[PDB]
Every structure is written in C-alpha cells, then in structure tokens.
Subunit: 123 residues, 3 copies
C-alpha cells in the first residue's frame, strides 16, 4: 500500500548514487586531462627553445661563413685578374651571382617563435 512510495523512492536513491559515481569518474578524468595538457604545453616550450637555439647557431655560423666566402671570391677574382675572373674561369649557368644574406630574416623567425612562447606564460 505504502510500498509504492518506498520502493520507488529506493530506486531513486540508488540511481542518484550512480550519478554521483559517474560524476566522480568524470572529475578525476578532467583533472587528468588538465595535467596532460600542461605537460604538452611544457614539451612544446622546451622543443621550441631547443630548436630555436639550434637555428640561432646555424644562422650565426652561416653569416660568418658567408662573409668568408665573399672575401675568398674577391681574392680569387684578383688572382684571376689576368684571366677574366671567376665569371670567366669556372664558367657556370649563373656562377658569379651574389650569395643571399638571410641572417636578419632567420633572426626575425627566431624572434617570432620567442614571442609565441612568451604567450604560454599568460593563457
């Protein structure tokens, strides 16, 4: 007689207890997702930093090497002054055309990566 309020309230209480179980699972899941995202952000910063260091050193050495090759070419055109220069002695499809200096443009790409990482410290 009353039983049709006891048993039905019973099924309510057991089911509410499941909802708290499901909520519990979910919470632990979310705290772990946040953990993993933090750890991913961290790997990104460190890799960007390692990579950019490597680019900085490649760039600086490239610029030094270029300055040396520029001077070598001069001192070869001088030693070949009798024989029309390199443009005339080694004979390529273009041969004598200048060497691009991309040190500033690469430094600017390093700057942009560094700017992007500063961003990770605010989000």
């Amino acid at each position: 007689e009353n039983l049709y309020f006891q048993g039905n309230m019973k099924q309510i209480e057991d089911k509410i207890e499941e909802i708290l179980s499901k909520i519990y699972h979910i919470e632990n899941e979310i705290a772990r997702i946040k953990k993993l995202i933090g750890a991913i952000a961290s790997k990104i910063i460190k890799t960007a930093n390692y990579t950019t260091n490597a680019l900085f050193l490649l760039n600086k050495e490239e610029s030094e090497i270029r300055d040396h090759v520029v001077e070598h070419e001069l001192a070869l055109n001088y030693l070949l002054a009798h024989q029309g220069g390199l443009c005339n002695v080694v004979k390529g499809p273009m041969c004598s055309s200048d060497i691009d200096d991309f040190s500033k443009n690469v430094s600017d790409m390093i700057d942009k990566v560094h700017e992007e990482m500063k961003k990770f410290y605010h989000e």
Copy 2:
C-alpha cells in the same frame, strides 16, 4: 508520513548538489576546449616560423656550397704545379666532397607543411 516528505527533501537537495557539480564540469570542459585550440594554433604558428627559418638556411647553404665548390676548382688551378689543393694543405681527408642535402631538407619542410595541413581537418 514525515519520513516520506523528509526523504523527498533530501533527494531534492542531492539533485541541487548534482546539478551544480555538472555545471562546474561543463565550465571546465569549455575552458579545456579553449586551451586545446589555443595550443593547436601555437603549434602551427611556431612550426611555420620554424620551417620558414629552415627554408632560408637551406637556400643560402646551397648557394654558399655552390661557390665553395667553384672556389676549390679555382684554387686547385692556382696550385696545379704544387699538386692542387690536397697536396699543399695536407689532410687525412682533404678531397672529401661537400654533401648537398638541400632536397632532403626541402622534403622535411614539405612534411612539416603536410602535417600542419591536417590541423585544418579537426
């Protein structure tokens, strides 16, 4: 009688606690999606600057290489009587050629670019 009404109060209270928990959850999911997208965007932007830097190092390296190889020929000429370069400088591997990896590096840049294309499909 009051056992029924009182237990109904308890249940309604638990629903109130549950629905507020679910809300904070939904707020946490919204903050997480914001972060994952912001992260994706930094990866793409970073990777772009990076391969742009790689492109320009590789291009100039290959140009530098072209001139050095010509410079060796021009020097080997100017030193022919004394056995070219690899007799007047003396080294355990003087004559070892200079690798030209410019196409392998371009292939890598293509691969980074192809990986970043796939971000626009999620």
Copy 3:
C-alpha cells in the same frame, strides 16, 4: 489531494534524473572527443619535431663540411697572397680573417635534447 502531493513530485524528480543522465551522457561524449584530440596533437608534435630535427641535423652536417673547406681555402689563399701580406692585408677588413665559429657540437646537443623531450611522450 493527499495522493498527488507525492506522485507529482516523484514524477518531476524522475524526469529531472532523466535529463541529468542525458547531460552526463553528452559530457562523456565530449570528454572522449577531447581525449582523442589531445592524442592527435601529441602525434602531430612528435612528427613535426622529428622532421624539424632531421632538417637541423642535415643543415648542421653540411654546414660543418662547408666550414672545413672554407678553412682549407683560407690557408690556401694565405699561401698564394703571402708575399703580398697574406689575406688579411690584401682584402682589408675591420676583422677580415676572423676565426669561424664551429657550432656543430652545440647544434647536435640541441638535437639530442629535442629527441629527449619526444621520448617522454612514450612514457606517459
């Protein structure tokens, strides 16, 4: 009177418990799509770092060889222009015949360190 002030309530309690089980179901779906998405981001980081380090590795190796050959040439051009004061007197530079930095080991160091970060993705 007496009988509805129980039944009506229980039905709205049930119907709310219905919507809760629903909102939960939808949350669990969003969580699964977030987890997959993090998984693809991590894979895209590992792959992109791998290609970038391979490019660095090749740029570095060839840069080293070039530098070795430029050093040779510097000595050769100092032998040829010697009676005229070497290369530093003839070329005229505020530094001119400066030494060339050799950062190959420092670059390889950075390569190692990236491989090291990427290793840890296999350990989580």
